């Protein structure tokens, strides 16, 4: 069960924690989406599909930085939707391909601020996902930890739109 980040980072078979650098829009108004769409940055695949067929879940989520200052949103995984970090465990998706396969995850965002300036701390850690992997042949239980790194400081629109 190998994997690779679109930036060239790769976690070998067995587990580990890796860093991904994702880009974000320079300006988000009142709740557009501020999505990450990690389905173009992480690609895991299976080793021996003849007998070993992998099953990939999102074990847990966590948020850090300016998201935990004033933000909210949802998370997508294979035609579903959950709130900010999943308090429950989402179901499994079968990885059974000896080929590249985008991981269908995202992170929707929306500002709960009323009057603020800078947001999403640049170069900081936006979120952490924990790819849990099981199989149909062994009790293999590891954690591909992925750490979302902010690439830019997202600026909330300035003051205005007020009445007496």
């Amino acid at each position, epitope marked *: 069960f190998a994997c690779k980040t679109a*930036n060239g980072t790769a976690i070998p078979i067995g587990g580990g924690s890796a860093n991904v650098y994702v*880009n*974000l829009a*320079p*300006a988000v108004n009142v709740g557009q989406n501020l*999505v*990450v769409d990690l*389905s*173009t940055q992480i690609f895991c695949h299976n080793d021996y599909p003849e007998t070993i067929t992998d099953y990939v879940t999102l074990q847990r989520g966590a948020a850090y930085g300016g998201v935990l200052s004033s933000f909210s949103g949802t998370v997508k995984y294979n035609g579903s939707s959950y709130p900010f970090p999943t308090t429950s465990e989402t179901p499994r998706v079968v990885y059974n391909s000896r080929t590249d396969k985008p991981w269908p995850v995202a992170l929707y965002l929306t500002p709960v601020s009323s009057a603020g300036g800078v947001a999403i701390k640049a170069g900081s850690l936006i979120a952490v996902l924990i790819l849990r992997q099981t199989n149909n042949y062994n009790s293999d239980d590891f954690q591909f930890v992925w750490n979302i790194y902010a690439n830019n400081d997202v600026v909330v629109p300035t003051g205005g739109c007020d009445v007496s």
Partner: antibody
Framework: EVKLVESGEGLVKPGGSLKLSCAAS????????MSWVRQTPEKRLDWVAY????????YYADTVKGRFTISRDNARNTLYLQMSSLKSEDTAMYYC??????????????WGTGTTVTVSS | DIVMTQSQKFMSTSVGDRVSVTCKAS??????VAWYQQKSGQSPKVVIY???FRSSGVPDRFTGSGSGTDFTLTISNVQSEDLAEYFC?????????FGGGTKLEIKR
């Protein structure tokens, strides 16, 4: 005003190397990353290289990796694209631009004068 | 890579018209496509970053849109000096690659 001065042109035989020199003016260098992009003359643009504002994060595209190294000094205020192992024409219009690299989103905001690279016999 | 495909020709437009310039992604680029204006053998200038916001020094006659796989740049009114090559670019998947560029032609 912000300007990106450029120097260090020269024809190169295949298997050689050149040091492309680029300097800046009008801002604080340590807070902005830089990038190198080649504009083939009125033709296909290609992103050559990226370097962080500090110099710790350094990536190259598939067409230039294994042949290029880059560096910068914050105080000296001069980039250096030290490129070698020449192959496959490469004849472009190389150009240093201030891309707002990591800790900001990629823009390639301002460009300077640019230099030319020719690979012939 | 992610080929940022765009029309391999120019788009005819007389003065006073509206310019629409296409740019097509084979793979899913999330958002944040840049648009530059490059004249005859000169430096490209940052015009529309992230395909939705204007840059400083760029007039209000400029704008654009696009998401998913399809992006477009637009000129509300074409003055005499605006006509040049116009470049679309993606930077949400390494290696970040530019578009083919679009040539602006007057009809006379």
């Amino acid at each position: 005003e912000v300007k990106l001065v450029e120097s260090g042109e020269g024809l190169v035989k295949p298997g050689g190397s050149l040091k492309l020199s680029c300097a800046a003016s009008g801002f604080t260098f340590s807070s902005y990353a830089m990038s190198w992009v080649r504009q083939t003359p009125e033709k296909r643009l290609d992103w050559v290289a990226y370097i962080s504002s500090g110099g710790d994060h350094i990536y190259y595209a598939d067409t230039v990796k294994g042949r290029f190294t880059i560096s910068r000094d914050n105080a000296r205020n001069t980039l250096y694209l030290q490129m070698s192992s020449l192959k496959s024409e490469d004849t472009a219009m190389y150009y240093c631009t201030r891309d707002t690299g990591y800790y900001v989103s990629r823009y390639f905001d301002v460009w300077g004068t640019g230099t030319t690279v020719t690979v012939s016999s | 890579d992610i080929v940022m495909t765009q029309s391999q020709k120019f788009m005819s437009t007389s003065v006073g018209d509206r310019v629409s310039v296409t740019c097509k992604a084979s793979q899913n680029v999330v958002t944040n496509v840049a648009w530059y204006q490059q004249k005859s053998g000169q430096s490209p200038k940052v015009v529309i970053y992230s395909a939705s916001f204007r840059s400083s020094g760029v007039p209000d006659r400029f704008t654009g849109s696009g998401s998913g796989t399809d992006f477009t740049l637009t000129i509300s009114n074409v003055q005499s000096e605006d006509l040049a090559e116009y470049f679309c670019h993606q930077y949400n998947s390494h290696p970040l690659t530019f578009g083919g560029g679009t040539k602006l032609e007057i009809k006379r």
